Design a protein around this ligand. Structure first.
Ligand SMILES: CC(C)([C@H](NC(=O)c1ccc(C#CC#CCCO)cc1)C(=O)NO)S(C)(=O)=O
Ligand SMILES: [Mg+2]
Length: 299
């Protein structure tokens, strides 16, 4: 009976998965491996000689059209946000993500398969304190009517509001206080509208997309035969995307995020503004899990 530091976590065992890239349609082999303390999440292109390694950090984000992409020179890793959301939701600090192709596999469009594979392998607590980024001041970015904000909050909470001119919503808004990740949002799938598909595919985007890995919406209806997993699956997926984009900070957050029609580009603009404003955040640890504002599942 004593105080217990909240510790960094990595994988207990290797995870292997095969899939297809949502936007490239390429077949890709994925391997998640444990990593030492303070490594962070690092993506490794193992189809290249030499292997190119890209830390999953805000400073390495290149394009943010359709998905969050990591770049180093001529080498990219596309669509990292759903896997990163699973890592953040489960509290994984350190891991190598090996990919045989430029895009993370889409799986079923959600973080569900990733959390299942990770939790089946199990997590391993490590002998070093977990570092948190605590929001100390309000930080806001806007572009037009889009908005993304960090607010101080003793915990971790994400709110999101979207406005789509579309019958399938019959405004969607949701707030989640991390209730917890596996239950609340992990299973929420990405979505696409048929009105955009021919244009997107002409741009070598959405080439792997299908009803097997996305909610496909036409003029009026969801086309997936078995429908939605949640009444508010769309905005729940926006929250999933935000959690993964925010994990590009490299540490879990103590604070609140509020998104208003935000997406990957504005999310990354928010992280860059936050990092530059060192008055607005500090790195903290917790030597006694009992007085911390966050708690994590058993490993
Ligand atoms: C929701 C987004 C934030 C983004 N999703 C996409 O990009 C996406 C997803 C699915 C399809 C499809 C299909 C099909 C079909 C049927 C056969 O042609 C196309 C695009 C995302 O989840 N990023 O993390 S989006 C678009 O609002 O930016
Ligand atoms: Mg998404």
């Amino acid at each position: 009976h004593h105080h217990a530091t909240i510790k960094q976590r990595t994988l207990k065992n290797i995870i292997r998965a095969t899939g297809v890239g949502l936007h490239s349609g390429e077949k890709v082999y994925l391997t998640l491996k444990p990593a030492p303390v303070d490594t962070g999440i690092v993506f490794c292109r193992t189809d290249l000689d030499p292997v190119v390694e890209i830390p999953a950090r805000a400073e390495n984000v290149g394009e943010t059209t359709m998905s969050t992409t990591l770049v180093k020179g001529d080498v990219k890793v596309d669509t990292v946000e759903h896997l990163l959301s699973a890592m953040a939701g489960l509290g994984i600090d350190n891991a190598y993500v090996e990919l045989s192709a430029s895009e993370v596999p889409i799986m079923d469009g959600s973080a569900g398969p990733f959390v299942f594979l990770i939790q089946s392998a199990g997590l391993q607590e490590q002998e070093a304190a977990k570092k948190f980024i605590r929001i100390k001041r309000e930080v806001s970015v806007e572009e037009g009517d889009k908005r993304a904000v960090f607010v101080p909050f003793d915990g971790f909470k994400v709110s999101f509001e979207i406005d789509f001119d579309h019958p399938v919503f019959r405004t969607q808004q949701a707030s989640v206080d991390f209730t917890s990740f596996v239950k609340e949002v992990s299973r929420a799938r990405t979505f696409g509208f048929m009105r955009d598909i021919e244009y997107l595919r002409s741009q070598n985007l959405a080439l792997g997309g299908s009803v097997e890995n996305a909610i496909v919406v036409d003029e009026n209806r969801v086309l997936n035969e078995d429908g939605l997993r949640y009444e508010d699956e769309f905005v729940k997926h926006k929250i999933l995307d935000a959690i993964g984009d925010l994990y590009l900070l490299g540490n879990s957050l103590i604070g609140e995020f509020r998104g208003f029609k935000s997406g990957h580009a504005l999310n990354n603009q928010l992280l860059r503004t936050l990092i530059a404003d060192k008055d607005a955040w500090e790195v903290v640890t917790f030597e006694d899990a009992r007085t911390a504002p966050i708690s994590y599942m058993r490993p």
